[PDB]
């Protein structure tokens, strides 16, 4: 990916403390709250009328776990993100029609969520490592768009 040995360890270490399900639901929920236009893909999910409703929506939470679970699995393949996300990239393009900008928005929200969750432990260098990781993951997911 290109991240130095110390950046990879900072990333991994913090991620070992992440409840993927909780953070997943929190990040997808905040994405839908902070950038409402991303709700366009989730009308089958039900009530998304208020921040509370979005955060408590069981479909949003379930999708959040699914999305962050795949992200989680991608942290094990930091040297080959494009390869790991190739089929998901094609799926999001050809079948889901998800504008790649959405991945970048999720990345920003995920970083704010880690910062809220971890406070002082999310230091400027740790953020910097995570910024490279979220940009890499978004680039890999957008790679097969045509």
């Amino acid at each position: 990916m290109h991240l130095t040995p110390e950046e990879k360890s900072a990333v991994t270490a913090l991620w070992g403390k992440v409840n993927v399900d909780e953070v997943g639901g929190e990040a997808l929920g905040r994405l839908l709250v902070v950038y409402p236009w991303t709700q366009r893909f989730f009308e089958s999910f039900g009530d998304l009328s208020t921040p509370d409703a979005v955060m408590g929506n069981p479909k949003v939470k379930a999708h959040g776990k699914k999305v962050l679970g795949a992200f989680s699995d991608g942290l094990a393949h930091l040297d080959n993100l494009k390869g790991t996300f190739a089929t998901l990239s094609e799926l999001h393009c050809d079948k889901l029609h998800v504008d790649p900008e959405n991945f970048r928005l999720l990345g920003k929200v995920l970083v704010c969520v880690l910062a809220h969750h971890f406070g002082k432990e999310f230091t400027p260098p740790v953020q910097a490592a995570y910024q490279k990781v979220v940009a890499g993951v978004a680039n890999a997911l957008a790679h097969k768009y045509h």
Partner: protein
Amino acid sequence: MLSPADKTNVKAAWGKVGAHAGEYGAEALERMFLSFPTTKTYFPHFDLSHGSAQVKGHGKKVADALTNAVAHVDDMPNALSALSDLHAHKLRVDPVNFKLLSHCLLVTLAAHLPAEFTPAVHASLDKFLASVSTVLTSKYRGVLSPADKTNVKAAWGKVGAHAGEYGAEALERMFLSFPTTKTYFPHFDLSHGSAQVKGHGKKVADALTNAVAHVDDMPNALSALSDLHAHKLRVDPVNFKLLSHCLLVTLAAHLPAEFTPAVHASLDKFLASVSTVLTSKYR
């Protein structure tokens, strides 16, 4: 942009920041230089090492400016006028950098306000920062001047009856050059010569003709279109800059004589205005 609820949220959050504003500002700056190194190009005269007096000093000036902005949230343009002048005319920081510092201030607030940073406050602070950024960047080129409005009307005039054909070409150019824009049209046949693209191109062109006619009253002229894109189509805002670019290329390809540098600058400002309007109701 900001609703009263948003203002109450920002006021609350920033209040909690209180005496730490200066320290949070320095941390946000440090977070920006580290996460986004291209931002250092604007500070080659600074000692950018952790804890420098220069970064701490600057951090306090940035936070005092946001405090001023919070305190005059209903009158931001005026409260920050000297700052927008300094950035637009002296500093000339590319506008893309404001989103970067805004994200880093947001991450800083998140790390320091565990109780206060709820989803609703997060959304409000994000909108607040995007508004501050917009104010500090408003005078880079400014609103449309009479020379601009005159240039746009003259150039759009020459387009005339070709408007729909140029709108279709602009869409075609956009789909080919920026493939991601195709994600919003999975129901269309996007092949060259497509009647759906031609028909849609005519609609975009007519909206722009309408915007040119109402250049001094654009927000109302485009109100229904703003609602439509904001709440029904929900097109991510970044895409508007891509279609604007493609419309400019189409105009250049067809107006050998009128696409002078001054007209080019006026049309770009005009399209950025139409884009701002079409996306004003997103949040």
